[PDB]
Design a binder for this molecule. Structure first.
Ligand SMILES: *SCCNC(=O)[C@H]1CCCN1S(=O)(=O)c1ccc(C)cc1
Ligand SMILES: *SCCNC(=O)[C@H]1CCCN1S(=O)(=O)c1ccc(C)cc1
Lengths: 261, 262
């Protein structure tokens, strides 16, 4: 995608060399922002084939508030496998915070249900937010949230969303995360009877891993193609009732996928 | 400042006309990002006179974990007065969250002490963050946080900081908030023996209130002056021991103050 390809190139040209906790190096920058007008097409990177299948199952798993990978396993999604414990648990990562943020008095807060009621009853609210950054539960998580907080906004019947991504693997994670949130916006817009607006992506520590440089050079020699179009084939009863077969991507014509370690 | 006037101009050229929570109309954009290299100068708006006095007191108060206006009111800082209850309490706003975020198991997390230790011992960490966005306590606060979350970053011996401001009053709030965080970056950097890098500002709902329009256009007819320079006179034993008198601004030569209703 043009903005994506400019970000890759910016890391290459201005990133500084760092070490990470794994001893693998990176090139990184701090602070970046991109905007995707979702009416221009679904923002799925076309300079490498990206499979939506795992993206879609993970989003639906998040919305059910499940943090055990059994559901992912039933549908052959393995992106979370290395962080799960012997029981398949991740601790209270994304899903748990989205649907049942734990309060000190034993109660839970459903942030998605709050956001839907804010979109439907108070769309101009300036606090239509979902945070996964539960400071009190970071030590229990298998991984601290990378797509840490997001905010919705309504203008002229269009639903926009901005994501603050505190840590971004530009090659591997970013195309996946852009798609995931673009999808959620389409689903929310549909449940609130709104049109789709912008997906604003803001990065904190934004990097390219050292072992992703050949792959990055390959990707930057390719030209982007027109974006595909998302089709939701069935409008369910609520935001918690989507199924994998409700989504279709049309006109997706990417270059061959690029594998990365 | 250049970045600040460019944002005002973007809100006027692109913003959507809507209404705030109390009706008071707004022009708003969604999503913005700007950067201030702190080595170029302390980012205190010059196109209207801004008083650093109150910004300093507020930050020293936040850093103590205080949420009662008494310290502010004694020092003639009245910006939080309208939100305070009859006992001067604001609820567990900013400072409480920063210094003692309450966990489910009964612990409290001191996010400022954590970030200081992560800057001294693991400066390349990708989670050197402070969040005031405590979902479980938002409705106990007098106001939900507007400068909601911030992250630090270290490169080439310089400390940078990015703030996510979910709701931004561009004319009244923003000049204050930029100066507040640039001061925090300076304090933290001093404490970790680092040099200052960039303050990165990101906005969510970024608006101009309709009754600030003539003031905004007035300000937009002026040229930004050279940035003032911040002199910290002492190196306290910790980030929690700074005093009002440790801070001096030099070379501040602003255009006239422009009053406006909150
Ligand atoms: S800061 C990145 C840390 N890793 C993650 O959070 C992983 C765990 C599985 C989901 N995410 S991801 O960054 O969205 C991702 C998705 C797909 C691949 C191939 C890698 C990483
Ligand atoms: S989203 C803005 C909501 N209002 C506030 O949080 C106020 C209360 C006092 C501090 N803040 S402020 O926006 O930083 C501010 C500071 C100074 C003035 C003159 C107005 C507002």
């Amino acid at each position: 995608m043009k903005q994506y390809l400019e970000l890759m190139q910016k890391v290459l040209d201005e990133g500084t060399q760092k070490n990470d906790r794994t001893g693998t190096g990176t090139l990184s920058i701090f602070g970046h922002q991109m905007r995707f007008n979702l009416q221009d097409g679904f923002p799925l990177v076309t300079t490498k084939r990206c499979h939506l299948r795992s993206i879609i199952h993970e989003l639906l798993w998040f919305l059910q508030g499940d943090t055990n990978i059994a559901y992912l396993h039933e549908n052959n999604v393995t992106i979370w496998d290395e962080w799960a414990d012997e029981n398949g648990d991740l601790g209270p990562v994304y899903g748990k915070q989205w649907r049942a943020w734990p309060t000190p008095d034993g109660r839970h807060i459903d942030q998605i249900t709050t956001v839907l009621n804010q979109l439907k009853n108070d769309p101009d609210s300036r606090r239509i937010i979902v945070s996964a950054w539960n400071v009190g539960e970071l030590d229990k998580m298998a991984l601290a949230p990378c797509h840490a907080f997001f905010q919705f906004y309504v203008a002229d019947g269009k639903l926009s969303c901005q994501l603050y991504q505190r840590s971004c693997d530009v090659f591997l994670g970013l195309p996946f995360n852009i798609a995931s949130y673009a999808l959620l916006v389409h689903m929310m817009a549909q449940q609130c009877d709104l049109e789709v607006g912008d997906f604003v992506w803001t990065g904190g520590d934004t990097h390219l891993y050292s072992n992703h440089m050949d792959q990055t050079h390959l990707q930057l020699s390719r030209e982007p193609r027109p974006l595909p179009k998302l089709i939701i084939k069935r409008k369910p009863e609520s935001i918690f009732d989507y199924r994998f077969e409700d989504f279709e991507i049309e006109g997706y014509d990417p270059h061959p996928g690029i594998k990365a370690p």
